[PDB]
Design an enzyme around this catalytic site. Structure first.
Site, PDB file in Angstrom:
ATOM      1  N   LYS A 172      -7.834 -57.336 -65.172  1.00  0.00           N
ATOM      2  CA  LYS A 172      -9.262 -57.062 -65.217  1.00  0.00           C
ATOM      3  C   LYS A 172      -9.881 -57.142 -63.815  1.00  0.00           C
ATOM      4  CE  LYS A 172      -9.399 -56.321 -69.559  1.00  0.00           C
ATOM      5  NZ  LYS A 172      -9.731 -54.983 -70.115  1.00  0.00           N
ATOM      6  N   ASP A 184      -8.580 -52.565 -64.849  1.00  0.00           N
ATOM      7  CA  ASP A 184      -9.511 -52.176 -65.901  1.00  0.00           C
ATOM      8  C   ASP A 184     -10.870 -52.778 -65.576  1.00  0.00           C
ATOM      9  OD1 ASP A 184     -10.889 -51.598 -68.280  1.00  0.00           O
ATOM     10  OD2 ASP A 184      -9.308 -52.433 -69.571  1.00  0.00           O
ATOM     11  N   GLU A 221      -8.900 -48.184 -65.262  1.00  0.00           N
ATOM     12  CA  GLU A 221      -9.241 -47.925 -66.654  1.00  0.00           C
ATOM     13  C   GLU A 221     -10.735 -48.117 -66.875  1.00  0.00           C
ATOM     14  OE1 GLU A 221      -6.790 -49.759 -69.591  1.00  0.00           O
ATOM     15  OE2 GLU A 221      -8.418 -49.994 -71.058  1.00  0.00           O
ATOM     16  N   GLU A 280     -10.469 -46.335 -75.041  1.00  0.00           N
ATOM     17  CA  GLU A 280     -10.503 -47.371 -76.075  1.00  0.00           C
ATOM     18  C   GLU A 280     -11.823 -47.378 -76.849  1.00  0.00           C
ATOM     19  OE1 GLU A 280     -10.016 -50.773 -73.292  1.00  0.00           O
ATOM     20  OE2 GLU A 280     -11.521 -51.769 -74.542  1.00  0.00           O
ATOM     21  N   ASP A 285      -7.524 -45.397 -79.402  1.00  0.00           N
ATOM     22  CA  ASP A 285      -7.565 -46.679 -80.077  1.00  0.00           C
ATOM     23  C   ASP A 285      -7.325 -46.431 -81.547  1.00  0.00           C
ATOM     24  OD1 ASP A 285      -8.571 -49.730 -80.019  1.00  0.00           O
ATOM     25  OD2 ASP A 285      -9.358 -48.714 -81.800  1.00  0.00           O
ATOM     26  N   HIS A 314      -4.594 -48.084 -76.357  1.00  0.00           N
ATOM     27  CA  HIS A 314      -5.232 -49.373 -76.208  1.00  0.00           C
ATOM     28  C   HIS A 314      -4.771 -50.267 -77.345  1.00  0.00           C
ATOM     29  CE1 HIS A 314      -8.737 -52.007 -77.423  1.00  0.00           C
ATOM     30  NE2 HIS A 314      -8.550 -52.395 -76.171  1.00  0.00           N
TER      31      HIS A 314
HETATM   32  O1  LIG Z   1     -10.415 -53.410 -72.316  1.00  0.00           O
HETATM   33  C1  LIG Z   1      -9.632 -53.951 -73.083  1.00  0.00           C
HETATM   34  N1  LIG Z   1      -8.238 -53.595 -73.018  1.00  0.00           N
HETATM   35  O2  LIG Z   1      -7.854 -52.713 -72.142  1.00  0.00           O
HETATM   36  C2  LIG Z   1     -10.107 -54.949 -74.112  1.00  0.00           C
HETATM   37  O3  LIG Z   1     -10.467 -54.260 -75.268  1.00  0.00           O
HETATM   38  C3  LIG Z   1     -11.328 -55.730 -73.630  1.00  0.00           C
HETATM   39  O4  LIG Z   1     -11.062 -56.345 -72.417  1.00  0.00           O
HETATM   40  C4  LIG Z   1     -11.774 -56.777 -74.616  1.00  0.00           C
HETATM   41  O5  LIG Z   1     -11.075 -57.974 -74.618  1.00  0.00           O
HETATM   42 MG   LIG Z   2      -9.487 -51.724 -71.500  1.00  0.00          MG
END
Ligand SMILES: O=C(NO)[C@H](O)[C@H](O)CO
Ligand SMILES: [Mg+2]
Ligand SMILES: O=C(NO)[C@H](O)[C@H](O)CO
Ligand SMILES: [Mg+2]
Lengths: 421, 421
Positions: free
Chosen positions: B217, B245, B271, B298, B321, B348
């Site tokens: 992240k 992401d 992402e 997603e 998703d 996702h």
């Molecule tokens: O972005 C995500 N996965 O890629 C998740 O859905 C998001 O971080 C929620 O926990």
């Molecule tokens: Mg994501």
């Protein structure tokens, strides 16, 4: 003034009984409102709603209640100090965002809540909403707007430039609005479920009333459409402006073929020829049916979709809706995007109280944003106005400027009881 | 077999305790499922869910209950004989459509209901969902899909050609799947709220386990991102593929600058650099961050948005998703569009049982659609698998193919009680 609580009402109206509202996608809508009242310690309460067509209204009610957690306890002054900030706050619960973001039930609900806040604000300062906003400075109007996900197409700076350019001549425009009102078109003769005989009578009524623009549903059966439009033209005369609305039902190639088959009727535009998410599709249809124009927007989910419709040249006419998106603030953002691209905004109306809402929105657009109204038409439909304390007033093809404090949306108390689902 | 009733469960897991799932948009998600069980006369029940992150799960619950009116009383054979017809039926109540259409709460709910039907079908015939679909002729798979609003880029005729082309090699790919599984990447080390120490430990674990791709992240604080990615590269080694992401937080111009500033880390892709609705925005970001790839999807609402992302070349990696959209059928439609444009699909996952769902979907894609898996990676996250009767199994960086009947989503009974909100 503090928002101290809220009440919700699942209100549903038996419009399907006469097929008022019927169209190629929605054969029997039951016009409904997910209605919200924001409570205060004071004399005023903020009323607002979002519009649905029956089943599913209770989902919007669920969403309104969820949003209430974010609004109950707020100081109205904190809201007024920076409403763009409040808008980020109310659409910004990351968990509630997941249900959207800024789309579907959670955003319909935001439209109701956000507009209810406007109702409260307007009541408190003693102004109709259109005047409350029109009287604001360019910076004050700019402050109302959350620009997130807009800045690649319209950044605050460019929006401020547009607002400053519109500022001279507001007073004159306000005066003109009082004298002339704001021109509107009628959809009242056009519902797809109507018999030919009823179509004829309502076309005559529309013409007699002084409307210069009339909209008709199409899209279910080509033979019916050719017949209906031929009949419509007969009754309405050659001078009348005719528009047609397919309510999303066609594929792209199907849309092009079908609209071109209705070209003899000289429609000004086709509204929602295909899915309200399909920007590139609308653009393809637009190229294929020119010089017939393309209009869309009543279900366009948010400013992010609108900005792409507008920037890609996918439409001629921008049809904002008052409570599909995040209420007035987001509508204003879209009106500014439309002004940058010199596209006219002809708001979707009808429904339950949508006329009551959009009259204010277009009037702000005229006074403080683009400064032009004569070549535009707000939608108007003559249904369900008897439920409102301050119904819109339309005569000779124009909305009269609202006078009462608030957003014109507050219903008579008896309605809140008699139409509870 | 007849669908005789349905039960819903508002299930919420306290994932915010350890900030599992945390990202730049969603600081403290509480992984939740709006869970549905379709009852029958017989021995099987169809279990399905849609995934949320806490508050607002109850709106999905309301929407599932609404869809129940369309599903309860249906005979399973009627569904099975034309699945595309059933899908149109469940998403085509014009009144429930108003709440979307095919977006937000009503469509999340559709994903749960549609997938629950798949679970029931798969149980009835005694196969995992992936094999239930893989054993189908091209015509039978085509029949599963509602193509409305897709025909301008992929019409049924051309989708059949794709399906027929994949037909001869199915037997070999199935053998290969049984032998090799399907490669996956891990997000288990990447959550934004984790300490640096925990980051190091999880990176070492991901590297030891044999993952070749690991996701992190970013997007809240640039200085944090620089330090964390420096640590990740250090712990994971040079051979590791690192992805990032941002969870939608950036404007277009902001996304380009921030991502390019992280170039030293060699991210394979960024992402969701911006709003999941901004097709033209993703495309601009894609041009600005080259050669770094763009992934999104997603939260992409439906086939109509995906179609535009794909056809306009706005993304490099398609992240479907399992239950954001109308469940398996709509995913298959998007996969066919992706196959046309030769864009890889990396689903996702994580959430509550999303891994359990998408494993089936990508295997269908491998066996029956695009015929390629080695260069792709399904997302995998190691959370909450203890709640499932038949959890996914990952070793050596690959999902083992499901072998028990159903869609792998059915939860243990104790979980349905213990985690009710
Ligand atoms: O972005 C995500 N996965 O890629 C998740 O859905 C998001 O971080 C929620 O926990
Ligand atoms: Mg994501
Ligand atoms: O399309 C519309 N107006 O233009 C209406 O909202 C729709 O027809 C439902 O009555
Ligand atoms: Mg319309």
């Amino acid at each position: 003034t503090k928002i101290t609580g809220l009440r919700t009402y699942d209100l549903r109206f038996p419009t399907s009984e006469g097929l008022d509202g019927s169209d190629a996608m929605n054969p029997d809508p039951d016009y409904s409102a997910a209605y919200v009242i924001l409570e205060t310690e004071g004399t005023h309460e903020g009323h607002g709603l979002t519009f649905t067509i029956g089943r599913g209204n209770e989902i919007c009610i669920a969403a309104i209640k969820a949003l209430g957690a974010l609004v109950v306890g707020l100081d109205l002054d904190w809201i007024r100090e920076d409403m763009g900030r409040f808008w980020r706050h109310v659409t910004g619960d990351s968990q509630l965002r997941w249900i959207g973001p800024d789309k579907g039930a959670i955003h319909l609900a935001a439209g109701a809540v956000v507009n209810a806040v406007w109702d409260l604000w307007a009541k408190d300062t003693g102004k109709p909403v259109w005047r409350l906003v029109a009287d604001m400075s360019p910076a004050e109007i700019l402050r109302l707007i959350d620009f997130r996900y807009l800045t690649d197409v319209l950044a605050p700076e460019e929006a401020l430039d547009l607002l400053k350019a519109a500022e001279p001549g507001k007073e004159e425009r306000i005066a003109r609005l009082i004298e002339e009102g704001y021109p509107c078109y009628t959809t009242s003769a056009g519902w797809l479920g109507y018999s030919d005989e009823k179509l004829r009578r309502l076309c005559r009524e529309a013409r007699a009333a002084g409307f210069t623009h009339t909209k008709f549903k199409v899209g279910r059966d080509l033979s019916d459409d050719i017949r209906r439009l031929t009949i419509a033209r007969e009754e309405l005369g050659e001078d009348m402006n005719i528009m047609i609305d397919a309510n999303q039902v066609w594929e792209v190639d199907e849309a092009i073929d079908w609209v071109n088959r209705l070209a003899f009727a000289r429609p000004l535009f086709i509204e929602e020829p295909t899915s309200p998410d399909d920007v590139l599709g609308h653009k393809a249809i637009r190229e294929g049916v020119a010089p017939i124009k393309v209009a869309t927007g009543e279900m366009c989910q948010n400013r992010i979709m609108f900005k792409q419709f507008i920037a890609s040249g996918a439409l001629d006419i921008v049809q904002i809706d008052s409570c599909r998106m995040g209420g007035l603030n987001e509508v204003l953002a879209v009106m500014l995007v439309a002004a940058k691209y010199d596209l006219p905004v002809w708001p979707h109306a009808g429904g339950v109280g949508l006329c009551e809402y959009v009259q204010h929105m277009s009037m702000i657009d005229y006074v403080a944003i683009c400064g032009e109204k004569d070549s535009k038409r707000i939608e108007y439909v003559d249904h369900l106005h008897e439920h409102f304390k301050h119904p819109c007033i339309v005569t000779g093809g124009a909305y009269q400027a609202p006078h009462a404090p608030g957003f014109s949306i507050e219903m008579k108390e008896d309605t809140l009881d008699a139409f509870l689902f």
